[PDB]
Design a protein around this ligand. Structure first.
Ligand SMILES: *[C@@H]1O[C@H](CO)[C@@H](O[C@@H]2O[C@H](CO)[C@@H](O)[C@H](O)[C@H]2NC(C)=O)[C@H](O)[C@H]1NC(C)=O
Ligand SMILES: *[C@@H]1O[C@H](CO)[C@@H](O[C@@H]2O[C@H](CO)[C@@H](O)[C@H](O)[C@H]2NC(C)=O)[C@H](O)[C@H]1NC(C)=O
Ligand SMILES: *[C@@H]1O[C@H](CO)[C@@H](O[C@@H]2O[C@H](CO)[C@@H](O)[C@H](O)[C@H]2NC(C)=O)[C@H](O)[C@H]1NC(C)=O
Ligand SMILES: *[C@H]1O[C@H](CO)[C@@H](O[C@H]2O[C@H](CO)[C@@H](O)[C@H](O)[C@H]2NC(C)=O)[C@H](O)[C@H]1NC(C)=O
Ligand SMILES: *[C@H]1O[C@H](CO)[C@@H](O[C@H]2O[C@H](CO)[C@@H](O)[C@H](O)[C@H]2NC(C)=O)[C@H](O)[C@H]1NC(C)=O
Ligand SMILES: *[C@H]1O[C@H](CO)[C@@H](O[C@H]2O[C@H](CO)[C@@H](O)[C@H](O)[C@H]2NC(C)=O)[C@H](O)[C@H]1NC(C)=O
Ligand SMILES: [Gd]
Ligand SMILES: [Gd]
Ligand SMILES: [Gd]
Ligand SMILES: [Gd]
Lengths: 329, 329, 329
């Protein structure tokens, strides 16, 4: 029909026009094989209450441990020391509290501060609670310092390297562009406006780019997601293949509707005493774990998907006439 | 033909009926960007042969190290201590055994207990073997304790958080549902029957859910795979987007057809002696490494794949007539 | 037309011939769920300048830390010891150099060797630079030893286990074949020519297979990518499903156009002095990090994609006639 010349003009503009340049269907996909490397640099001062001023080389003292891709920056802490294998009073709790040896005797014990020895002992002159053997003295139940001890970390800076490969199209590139000289990377610092190609990011600015604050986050900790996205049209020059960096808070702020708020964990330092006995320093550290999430797809031109889709274009226009005929009169 | 009205009624029921509601082809795929966090809690008692009763805070003493997603729980061990840099007798082995200094002189040495010094020394009054410098005293060749030292670990419990995102559909959710209050997560424990939405899992129950046993596995160690699966139809409410948890033993039990049976590795503890000399405690730990494997796909409605497939539906029915004609008379 | 019998003979040979056996479109894809395990074995001798001959059990002394999949082998190092919390002279640098207390007073300080105390102190009789509190004595600025301290590592050997699963086709296998006895894996060593099925690889041979050299790489470090590829046609016997191993240097050699050349990082060893004071040994270690990258796809037969494509085959041949008619006369 006369509408058939209109529809044929519509489908030609539909596929070639719509489906190809917009949806780009004429290509075959391939996902990214990725590897990433990070180097945090920076140092941090802390005037501890008693211990006096102290240094923290984010290098060695601040990163437990040195991870594969991701990584965790220490920001806050509760430090218990001179701990040893010994018996001692549980922390004051209605579940731990006792009147005499009769109350202390368990599954919950091993879930709490340590393993319960039947004996009952005074947690202080004022009160009494079940004795347990454990690492003693027990860690003091307190909220983490505020503001953060390693608040200087806002200003630490991380270098992020990222080699990737699309196995299928035997192609591979690195987030560091060849146009970029080494002397520039000697002191550049990423920024969306000025330096998009600087792979050195500032921790504060990472948190911040994410609609967050390194300071209100550094107290109780959290996890920052550093999303890298590799989209490359391989039929285009390999020069136009470029990484986009996005940022995201992953942990939940809301106190309600969650558990283990923020991000922290304990680790220790063991010491062979000159006496031959064991002692350890236990440390509950809060901090920000940065996860580097890499992803992307790519595609060159290809006959099979193209003809596959074009074919469907011709079957589609068949019905287009019935649609035009029912619409028009 | 008359069969053409039958076939057209078949293809309409074939695509819309079969291919769409079953195979759901009318959607576009998107894979999951994932991050996971874990918190193991629990303590464990061990009455060591000589050393007497001892505590092991799965927190600090039990997890080497504190990993990104995955994690490894200590269950069993062989502990060699007071080790130092020094010379000493290899372990009795036909390859190590010697009659005099003539036999000891290598590539295998450096492959064995330590580097071979030519001298030959008696491993005991009864026998003799090549001297080597190494960390000495050498670790005693024995099978790991049975039952497991940290058998209490069956009952440790891990909390598992999992934030995910589909980049394409700018959508993201967390395994912890909003319907779930915090006070519940204060002591809930996952279970298929009662508490499907409790993200706190019990190590025994994880092993167990996998058709295995934490006790027969904890002696010599292994790796548990905790598979999380995120399938979401995004055209449906984001509320129906939910995680399914599956369990799997990854290591091979069979003694034959494998190497490094179960799962263990050695690590050490270094100590600056008051004398200024070095000493270390070497530890071969067996345990269960839990790998959290996250994956899934999703899809909203879309025109391109739909019309693409519908088009093929019309080309398909064309041949359906030749099939009906050859069948019927 | 007469050319229509030619085209129909072309498309039948085009799809069934070209698109199916070559491009294999009649299948549905599924990507790999992977887990990997590694065990490095080997020991290494080092005749240190002063300290004398010394052993390094790649087990405990050589791997910091014991990683999930990937792993890092120590090859070279700069070792600073008896470090303590204290004040001391910065390293000679035009930015650090000073004439008197007036010059020392900062953001750069905290970026450098330590936090600047106003006082100015002589770095030596010859010169003077700003005093800072830090871990002191500062680490000596030198290039890493050459040749590598743990050069013996060329010859260390790693065992690599790899369990994988395609969730969709409920299928899963392991890089260790059932045909392979355990007694063989007791001393086999991978090699392309003789032993393709030996999952024990030699570090030198890994580097080497990659068109590189463990020795010129071990001085300043780098990252080796161990690419495993799982392609399985699941309509074929599950026996033909096999892993291919490829090798790749990931870091950039070129001095220009990069930062943090090679691969190294610092970590420390803490010691409670008999005096009650703290001291630590700081260590900048160069080495080779091996990343095990696993990937692959698979597919069984399927009706939907097949008919989808066949359908497009019939729509395609429609236009083939117009092409043959315009070509031929
Ligand atoms: C090396 O690297 C930098 C970064 O690309 C170059 O600096 C940029 O170059 C252009 C052109 O002059 C300026 O318009 C931009 O402002 C520069 N970016 C920044 C943040 O400095 C620099 O030119 C290069 N050095 C040489 C000599 O090649
Ligand atoms: C908070 O969380 C829990 C878990 O969803 C709620 O307990 C469930 O709610 C229903 C409805 O009463 C019960 O039928 C299920 O047995 C409960 N699950 C378990 C294991 O307890 C609880 O109601 C919530 N608390 C409030 C007050 O909202
Ligand atoms: C156990 O494993 C090995 C490795 O597959 C077998 O050795 C191979 O078997 C064939 C057949 O004789 C030889 O042609 C190859 O040279 C062998 N490979 C190597 C590198 O040795 C060995 O036969 C097996 N042992 C038994 C008894 O089954
Ligand atoms: C940690 O440090 C101090 C100093 O060594 C310990 O001091 C004393 O505590 C002991 C336990 O009751 C007694 O055994 C000692 O005799 C006493 N001091 C001396 C001079 O030996 C203290 O115990 C330690 N704290 C713990 C219990 O972990
Ligand atoms: C580990 O601990 C003990 C106690 O210090 C060591 O005791 C002795 O061993 C030495 C090595 O032959 C001699 O050098 C010493 O004189 C002797 N004891 C004293 C009082 O010094 C023992 O060597 C250590 N074990 C090793 C060798 O690692
Ligand atoms: C590391 O080891 C030595 C040996 O203990 C230290 O020796 C001395 O240094 C001190 C710092 O000025 C003085 O406080 C001491 O009195 C002196 N020796 C003695 C016998 O105490 C040396 O300080 C240490 N190095 C540093 C500063 O880290
Ligand atoms: Gd990791
Ligand atoms: Gd701020
Ligand atoms: Gd049991
Ligand atoms: Gd060599």
């Amino acid at each position: 029909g006369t509408l058939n010349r209109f529809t044929q003009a519509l489908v030609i503009a539909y596929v070639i026009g719509y489906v190809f340049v917009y949806n780009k269907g004429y290509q075959d996909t391939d996902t990214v094989l990725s590897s990433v490397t990070t180097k945090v640099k920076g140092i941090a001062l802390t005037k501890t209450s008693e211990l006096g001023e102290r240094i923290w080389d984010v290098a060695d003292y601040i990163i437990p441990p040195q991870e594969d891709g991701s990584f965790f920056v220490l920001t806050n802490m509760i430090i218990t020391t001179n701990q040893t294998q010994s018996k001692c009073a549980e922390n004051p709790t209605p579940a731990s509290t006792c009147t005499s040896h009769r109350d202390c005797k368990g599954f919950n014990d091993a879930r709490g501060d340590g393993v319960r020895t039947g004996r009952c002992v005074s947690y202080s002159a004022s009160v009494k609670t079940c004795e347990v053997l454990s690492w003693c003295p027990l860690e003091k139940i307190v909220d983490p310092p505020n503001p953060p001890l390693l608040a200087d970390a806002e200003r630490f800076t991380v270098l992020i390297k990222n080699n990737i490969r699309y196995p299928k199209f035997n192609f591979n590139k690195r987030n560091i562009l060849p146009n970029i000289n080494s002397s520039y990377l000697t002191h550049c610092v990423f920024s969306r406006k000025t330096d998009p190609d600087c792979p050195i990011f500032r921790l504060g600015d990472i948190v911040g780019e994410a609609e967050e604050d390194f300071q209100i986050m550094a107290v109780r900790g959290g996890v920052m997601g550093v999303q890298i996205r590799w989209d490359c049209d391989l039929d285009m020059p390999q020069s136009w293949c470029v990484p986009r960096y996005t940022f995201r808070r992953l942990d939940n702020k809301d106190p309600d509707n969650n558990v283990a708020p923020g991000y922290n964990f304990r680790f220790a330092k063991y010491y062979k005493n000159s006496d031959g006995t064991e002692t350890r320093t236990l440390i509950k550290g809060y901090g920000i774990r940065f996860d580097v999430m890499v992803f992307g797809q790519a595609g060159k031109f290809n006959i099979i998907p193209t003809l596959l889709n074009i074919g469907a274009g011709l079957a589609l226009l068949g019905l287009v006439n019935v649609i035009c005929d029912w619409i028009v009169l």
